Amino acid sequence: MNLTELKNTPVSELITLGENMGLENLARMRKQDIIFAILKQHAKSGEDIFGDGVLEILQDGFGFLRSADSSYLAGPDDIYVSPCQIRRFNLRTGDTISGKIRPPKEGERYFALLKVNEVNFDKPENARNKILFENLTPLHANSRLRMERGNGSTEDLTARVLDLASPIGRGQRGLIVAPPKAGKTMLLQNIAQSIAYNHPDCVLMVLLIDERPEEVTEMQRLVKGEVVASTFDEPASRHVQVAEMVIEKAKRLVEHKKDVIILLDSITRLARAYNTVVPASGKVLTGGVDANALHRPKRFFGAARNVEEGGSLTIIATALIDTGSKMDEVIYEEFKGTGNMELHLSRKIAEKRVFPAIDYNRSGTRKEELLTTQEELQKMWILRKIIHPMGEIDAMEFLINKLACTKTNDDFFEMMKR
Amino acid sequence: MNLTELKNTPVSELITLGENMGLENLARMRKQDIIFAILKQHAKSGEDIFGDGVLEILQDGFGFLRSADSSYLAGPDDIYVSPCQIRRFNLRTGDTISGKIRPPKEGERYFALLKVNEVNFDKPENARNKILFENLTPLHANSRLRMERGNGSTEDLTARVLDLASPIGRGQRGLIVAPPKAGKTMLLQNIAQSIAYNHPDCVLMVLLIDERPEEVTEMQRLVKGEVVASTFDEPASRHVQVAEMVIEKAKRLVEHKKDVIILLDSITRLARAYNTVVPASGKVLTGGVDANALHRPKRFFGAARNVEEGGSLTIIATALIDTGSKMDEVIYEEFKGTGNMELHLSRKIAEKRVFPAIDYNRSGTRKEELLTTQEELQKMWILRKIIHPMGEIDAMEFLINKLACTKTNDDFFEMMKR
Amino acid sequence: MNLTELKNTPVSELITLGENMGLENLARMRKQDIIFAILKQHAKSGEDIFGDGVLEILQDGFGFLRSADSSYLAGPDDIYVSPCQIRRFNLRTGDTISGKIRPPKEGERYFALLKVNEVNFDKPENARNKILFENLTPLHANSRLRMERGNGSTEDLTARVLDLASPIGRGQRGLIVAPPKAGKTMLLQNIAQSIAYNHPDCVLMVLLIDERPEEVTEMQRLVKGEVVASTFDEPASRHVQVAEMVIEKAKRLVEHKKDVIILLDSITRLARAYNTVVPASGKVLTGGVDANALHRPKRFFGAARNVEEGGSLTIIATALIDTGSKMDEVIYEEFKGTGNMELHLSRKIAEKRVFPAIDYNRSGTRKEELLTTQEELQKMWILRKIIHPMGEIDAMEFLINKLACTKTNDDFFEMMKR
Ligand SMILES: O=C1C=CC(=O)N1CCN1C(=O)C=CC1=O
Ligand SMILES: O=C1C=CC(=O)N1CCN1C(=O)C=CC1=O
Structure with missing residues (x-):
């Protein structure tokens, strides 16, 4: 139902879901093609498809919804954004944009978004x-x-x-x-x-x-x-x-x-x-x-x-x-x-x-x-007066064994004094 | 059995093949991961494997068998060829070779070819x-x-x-x-x-x-x-x-x-x-x-x-x-x-x-x-003389109907004369 | 025995001649290296080898006897000549030098000319x-x-x-x-x-x-x-x-x-x-x-x-x-x-x-x-007085048929005057 959901869907289930609609030879095709085919199978039938991404604005008002799993790399799966979408809702880079994905127009290799449903994990009217x-x-x-x-x-x-x-x-x-x-x-x-x-x-x-x-x-x-x-x-x-x-x-x-x-x-x-x-x-x-x-x-x-x-x-x-x-x-x-x-x-x-x-x-x-706290810095102040006058190589070895024996640092702060 | 079989195979077969020897989590990972997993599965068991590729020669004598399907792009599946390997068996750039693949060593991310079986559909000795x-x-x-x-x-x-x-x-x-x-x-x-x-x-x-x-x-x-x-x-x-x-x-x-x-x-x-x-x-x-x-x-x-x-x-x-x-x-x-x-x-x-x-x-x-042939050229030459004074647009329009009305070019020449 | 004979020897025969000594794997090499490789077989034999080339004095003072069959390409078979050798016999670029060739010494990537037998199809003393x-x-x-x-x-x-x-x-x-x-x-x-x-x-x-x-x-x-x-x-x-x-x-x-x-x-x-x-x-x-x-x-x-x-x-x-x-x-x-x-x-x-x-x-x-001659030129001017008033294609066409009528041009001159 969601474009990002199909990305993490195992390929074994992807073929079965596609074949239920009536797709063909999904096993031979690539996983991206299977995902794209399901997008194609709902674009013609008018069935809405969900999806989300992180806004990546460009110099002409258009943008793309990069995927976190993709390391924000440009690709066909990114949801194209238009300068008009900035007019409808104020758009900033890094925004989390969610909504129904519309079929792409002619000459567009990226699926566009008909409208935005969630902005930064919240409603657009409140996120703005x-x-x-x-x-x-x-x-x-x-x-x-x-x-x-x-x-x-x-x-x-x-x-x-x-x-x-x-x-x-x-x-x-x-x-x-x-x-x-x-x-x-x-x-x-x-x-x-x-x-x-x-x-x-x-x-x-x-x-x-x-x-x-x-x-x-x-x-x-x-x-x-x-x-x-x-x-x-x-x-x-x-x-x-x-x-x-x-x-x-x-x-x-x-x-x-x-x-x-x-x-x-x-x-x-x-x-x-x-x-x-x-x-x-x-x-x-x-x-x-x-x-x-x-x-x-x-x-x-x-x-x-x-x-x-x-x-x-x-x-x-x-x-x-x-x-x-x-x-x-x-x-x-x-x-x-x-x-x-x-x-x-x-x-x-x-x-x-x-x-x-x-x-x-x-x-x-x-x-x-x-x-x-009021007493937390006092205890480490004493430790400052202890570690500093001597070397740190031996001090690091000293505290490692003592910290293992002690349960909490507050309890650990008490054992050097006694 | 062969690496190229693994590269070109519907994912459903790899899932069955992986579970044959107990490999799990096959559906979650990508297509190339199970290919790496199945190949490593035979590496531990010692099962014989085979592969092939197109040799790319670098500036140091080492090389990788690039894949024609991947447009010879860089990839982990490329078989590493040592500079001593090409000295043992005289090979050049672009040579199609095949043989047994040995598992990569620790610190090496690419498989290696221990032995060469066929070089461009020929024995390495005969090909040399x-x-x-x-x-x-x-x-x-x-x-x-x-x-x-x-x-x-x-x-x-x-x-x-x-x-x-x-x-x-x-x-x-x-x-x-x-x-x-x-x-x-x-x-x-x-x-x-x-x-x-x-x-x-x-x-x-x-x-x-x-x-x-x-x-x-x-x-x-x-x-x-x-x-x-x-x-x-x-x-x-x-x-x-x-x-x-x-x-x-x-x-x-x-x-x-x-x-x-x-x-x-x-x-x-x-x-x-x-x-x-x-x-x-x-x-x-x-x-x-x-x-x-x-x-x-x-x-x-x-x-x-x-x-x-x-x-x-x-x-x-x-x-x-x-x-x-x-x-x-x-x-x-x-x-x-x-x-x-x-x-x-x-x-x-x-x-x-x-x-x-x-x-x-x-x-x-x-x-x-x-x-x-002599008759074809003589028929060809008279066609050029007649077509020369005509313009480029009219020559094509005159020609398309003449060939369409016929079946073969030799039969097309008969109607031009007759 | 003769370097230039091997140069004109076909590469198919070159491999067969290389098997007479016992050397193998000469196929995966240039034509120039095959002759260089087989020459080293006779270099150890001590048999005198004949050869020749075209001298190309370098800017340093030495030169090479490039081969005409090699299109004067800088190949491994280019015989080296010492700068002192062009002092005993005054030689410049383009001199044809033929003589026996000694095997190269240690570190000598090119052969050397032991004796200048002939220069420009003449004695070296006559060359100066x-x-x-x-x-x-x-x-x-x-x-x-x-x-x-x-x-x-x-x-x-x-x-x-x-x-x-x-x-x-x-x-x-x-x-x-x-x-x-x-x-x-x-x-x-x-x-x-x-x-x-x-x-x-x-x-x-x-x-x-x-x-x-x-x-x-x-x-x-x-x-x-x-x-x-x-x-x-x-x-x-x-x-x-x-x-x-x-x-x-x-x-x-x-x-x-x-x-x-x-x-x-x-x-x-x-x-x-x-x-x-x-x-x-x-x-x-x-x-x-x-x-x-x-x-x-x-x-x-x-x-x-x-x-x-x-x-x-x-x-x-x-x-x-x-x-x-x-x-x-x-x-x-x-x-x-x-x-x-x-x-x-x-x-x-x-x-x-x-x-x-x-x-x-x-x-x-x-x-x-x-x-x-004074009469042949007079006959030529008759054709000049005929062709010049005519065109460039018809006169050429007129030239072809009339010339084809006779066998020799003087006979063609006779029929033009009659
Ligand atoms: O992009 C801007 C900015 C102002 C403006 O009127 N538009 C065009 C609106 N618009 C699209 O962009 C795609 C379909 C559509 O109706
Ligand atoms: O090679 C150079 C360059 C300058 C020079 O004096 N030499 C030595 C001359 N030389 C030979 O090489 C062999 C016999 C002989 O007289």
Whole structure:
């Protein structure tokens, strides 16, 4: 009944559904042809077909409804949008548009939408009355994003220690420093699982730029939520196009008072793609960086905020450091003072194969009093006076064994004193 | 048993085959996933498997057996060929090979061929004892190819005109010049049906480059022989890649003493693709083209010949004129006298809606005496003298009724005399 | 035993001769490498091997003895000559060098000449006693080349027309003007047969520039002399490389008092090739022809002369007109008042299937009184006074039938006066 529903429908049932109408030789045809044939079998008979997609506007008022499972890639299955649809209902990039799909006209290879039934998971008359995200008033992160799973496993301790190292709240524009071979991938999956566990209501999203497909498949199954990525073989134009429209989806949910969490890996690659896409300004930076190239990621990264009116937008990007590229240091420096949170994976402890390997002394955050309680920050203040005077390699080994024995971090906070 | 069987098989059989050895979740995943699963199912069990493909030689000696069905696009199913494999068994680009497939190693995403069974329908030892294509002795086309279908259909009437305008022999380097918007695509479709019916032994290959997918899909459904095509959506790097792959595969068939016919659409746009990929040389001719840019497309067009020792290589290409761009016009001027067969097309006939649409008086073939007989040529020559003073529009209108009122071209000549 | 014998040995026999030593898998290689491979078999045997070539001194100081059968292509069989070797015997480009060849040493990718047995069909010491070409005094041609076959055959009639239209003498810098499809190649084939038939003593060379591969092999099976060519698939620099090797080899034979005849097809193609190769001079004429580009082909065309010291140099270069390109028209405008004789072909006579299609009114030669006798020239003027009032086709038609009535032109002269 729904075009997107037929996409996930198993091919075994697709032939049976098509053959019930009276189709033929569906087994030999491709799955897309079977889906298109069912669209053809209802276009002639006048039967309405449902569907939905994410708006992807263009320069002439026309747009397409890209699919999340398609990584927002252009294709025949995308629902074409017309400039008239903007006149009927105010249209913005990243909008979730749902409605009955009309048959295409002559010369159109994409099925058009006769009318819109739902906008951003809500009625068009009510979704058009939402205040813009840019006109909102940002506020400091106050609602702490609890991450402690409490399972007692080794990976459970990882979520516990990140709360102790640098607390993360809703709308906190975080940032992490990743030296090569620091196990950054494992912690992100562990963090995402706790995100879906602790806060199933939030729209947890994962964005991967210039990443190998093996981790892309791993992210989709491990993360209990929508996962989008751009292949490492894709050109830089795809990387900037994917990332720009991802935040458009995130912003509309913020306009609908929905908490959004975006995991980015890596902002260094995203900045590198943006540098190669924009035209040269004539003034270059050290390491071969365009002057106005840094402006684009700032808008993307700077949007992460805890909106005072309602909802939040959290972006946790990954900074590539000590990777041997001169472009990596300049990107990190340009974003050094941008994020409200900093985490530094310890490569020295990584060579010791101790996971997680976090530089507790170097890592930290600002305005953590809002996230912490009256006594929560006091306990970690004592821990600050303990780990900092000594080395972090031995301290990380010390807390890992003690955190396993302790059930809760509050209970864990008591055992060092006694 | 064979990899190509898995690639071309209705999905219902793979579901049954997968469940035979206990493979599950077959309906949920895509068609290529179960193919990977079933192939890996035999990899663990040690069951013998087979495969085939068209060899693509890279700059390092490694290569992948590209698939003709996928327009020689990149894919996981391409069999990896090591640089030592081609040294153990002397192979070249475009060679059709088959054998047993070994499972990929860890860290390798492509299957490999441990042993080679057949090379272009021949043993690898016997195939390596074959004369190279370039060292052969080219000659004029002497074996006449019967273009007329003889069934009397409407498309047969179009076919009869070509025998009266420009006879085609084996290995003849033909050439078609045609302004757009004249139904050129369907005119070449009549050629494919005639050649396949009249000469099923000849390897009929059709290349479509830089065309809409609607015409690409129409070619496969209407041509019995192999068709390799790529749309203009792909970059020019694929255009040369899809053109170089086809001709090299065709060349090896000549070494196997087999006639091969290539139909190209279009050479004019093909040269532009070569004009873009070629690196800058510092000297640019008028119209934005480079002299070195036109060298390589000449080599592709110059490969057509009637080899005396055995086999042939017939190339028929269509040139685009009246496009309002100096890039296209300079190609026809450069490729003017290169082809033995020259068929002209005019929009004036196209406006008159006369099918076929060819400038009869100006079109002809050189060294046609080897193809036609003495009586046929004498009848042919008197036809040209009578048709010469008449205009292009009137010649076609006078000719169509004369051939329609008859059955065969030989019988058509009887009524012209009588 | 003999390198040049292996070069002319057919490739089918080359594989069989390679099995005499015991070497296998020579089929999947070029024709040049097969001779190179089998030479190494005899290199270890120590048997002296004979061979020859055409010297091409490189800019560094060494050179190679390119093979005429290889069309002066840079192949593995090119014998290397030390720069000191051209100091013992003063040699320049185009010298014919024959002698024994030593096996290559370690790291020597090319063979080497151990002894200079003969230079230009003479002793090496006698080679240094010949005056340079430019120091020779040019002179008007006076030794008539009797082009008439004398057998009264059908093809002899074409030679009868040419001798009646514009006599050719030793050193006559001819120029043939021909529109497309005017039966140009038929005339050149007819000329070449007559020259080798009537005058076997004079050295005959045929140069084909930008010619289809079908025609090159057709010519090599008819002309009883050296034939070199460069197909259009070869680069532009290859078009001028063979042309330089032809004139330089021709000049050396003039120094030894040998009449060398060069039939060129065509001067337009050679001029276009030279335009591409040479750098732009900043002064571009109409049609894209560089002003400084035409200095090189003129020198090639300007070498034809009747040297007073003995010998000559005859060049009959075909010119292309009405090709639809302004570049070809500019070239002809710079060679109009250059040739010693002209021969205009007419497409109109060709369309009437009258051969040879020679414009008798326009074609002619200058200072023809030196070639013919005072009475034969008087007879020729009678035909001039007859043809000139007539047309160009009817007079040509009148020429064909009257010439076919008799066997020799002097007999045709008798019947015209009666
Ligand atoms: O697109 C605009 C913007 C103003 C306007 O009148 N239109 C045309 C409306 N329109 C479509 O676009 C398709 C069918 C149809 O009636
Ligand atoms: O090869 C070069 C280049 C400059 C030079 O002096 N030489 C050596 C000359 N030389 C040979 O090579 C063999 C015998 C002989 O006298």
